UniProtKB/Swiss-Prot annotation, chain B:
It comes from Homo sapiens (Human). Widely expressed. It comes from the Eukaryota. Disulfide bonds: none annotated. The MPN (JAB/Mov34) domain mediates interaction with TSSC4 and SNRNP200. Has structural similarity with deubiquitinating enzymes, but lacks the residues that would bind the catalytic metal ion. The lineage of its organism: Eukaryota, Metazoa, Chordata, Craniata, Vertebrata. Plays a role in pre-mRNA splicing as core component of precatalytic, catalytic and postcatalytic spliceosomal complexes, both of the predominant U2-type spliceosome and the minor U12-type spliceosome. Functions as a scaffold that mediates the ordered assembly of spliceosomal proteins and snRNAs. Required for the assembly of the U4/U6-U5 tri-snRNP complex, a building block of the spliceosome. Functions as a scaffold that positions spliceosomal U2, U5 and U6 snRNAs at splice sites on pre-mRNA substrates, so that splicing can occur. Interacts with both the 5' and the 3' splice site. Part of the U5 snRNP complex. Component of the U4/U6-U5 tri-snRNP complex composed of the U4, U6 and U5 snRNAs and at least PRPF3, PRPF4, PRPF6, PRPF8, PRPF31, SNRNP200, TXNL4A, SNRNP40, DDX23, CD2BP2, PPIH, SNU13, EFTUD2, SART1 and USP39. Component of the U5.U4atac/U6atac snRNP complexes in U12-dependent spliceosomes. Within the minor spliceosome, which acts on U12-type introns, interacts with PPIL2 and RBM48. Core component of U2-type precatalytic, catalytic and postcatalytic spliceosomal complexes. Found in a mRNA splicing-dependent exon junction complex (EJC) with SRRM1. This is Pre-mRNA-processing-splicing factor 8. Residues 1-160 are annotated as: RNase H homology domain. It is linked to Retinitis pigmentosa 13: A retinal dystrophy belonging to the group of pigmentary retinopathies. Retinitis pigmentosa is characterized by retinal pigment deposits visible on fundus examination and primary loss of rod photoreceptor cells followed by secondary loss of cone photoreceptors. Patients typically have night vision blindness and loss of midperipheral visual field. As their condition progresses, they lose their far peripheral visual field and eventually central vision as well. It is found in: Nucleus; Nucleus speckle.
């Protein structure tokens, strides 16, 4: 990937080997993506942003990009699939019942990693959050 | 239906047609500038639960309108707001069913995908002509079709 300035330098690089037109593609969604479910039931997918963001080739020289997230982030390092499923559905149910209050519970400096959809919390912080989400649902 | 691309955007096929109408000597000259990032429409699904799979479009896909033709010179490329796309875990269900009913259906599908992912995917495709809209994550099903699928997913969970 090249910068605007580097592409301009390749272009004027001619003299009438230069075409009368240039073909330009529309801007896509800039990876890495930010994905979250905090606006449940919506899934929000956001792109990023002298940037190196261009390629220039012969039109004549003509697989889709795939990005993975995980509804469990990295939890399966610590906990079972059963426990993970249970935590996920509890979070979704809380977001469903009381979206504003759930979002506050999940942000008790609390950080969600760029490649994660849920905050980074210790085992003991998750226990406290689970108690709070349950109380949120019971208060409905 | 998501808002498509404006008139100025040509498909790779349309631009290729333009090029082929030029003097043959001019055709190998033609240059394309590609912008980094994944091209929309995005395709999203949860069938590889717990993974969320997000797939971009490709520049040469049939009817992918993504190319502009401008006069040769200094390129004019305007920095802009980052793209944001919204999908919905309930697709369009809330047009006909309540939030309670949609939540219940959602968690039933997730539970089946958790319990028996291969069988759940088959249940979610009851017919060679079962499709999922490009802006949807679940199949387009009639109300009878959803009733049957919910029965089958429950039977899947009970069998394991």
């Amino acid at each position: 990937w090249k910068t605007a300035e580097e592409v301009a330098a390749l272009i004027r690089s001619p003299v009438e080997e230069q075409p009368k037109q240039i073909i330009v593609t529309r801007k896509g969604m800039l990876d890495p993506l930010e994905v979250h479910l905090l606006d449940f039931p919506n899934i929000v997918i956001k792109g990023s942003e002298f940037q190196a963001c261009l390629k220039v080739e012969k039109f004549g020289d003509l697989e889709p990009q795939m990005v993975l997230f995980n509804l469990y982030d990295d939890w399966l390092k610590t906990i079972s699939s059963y426990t993970a499923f249970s935590r996920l559905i509890l979070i979704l149910r809380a977001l469903h019942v009381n979206n504003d209050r759930a979002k506050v519970i999940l942000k008790p400096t609390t950080i969600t990693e760029p490649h994660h959809i849920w905050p980074t919390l210790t085992d003991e912080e998750w226990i406290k959050v689970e108690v709070q989400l349950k109380d949120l649902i019971l208060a409905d």
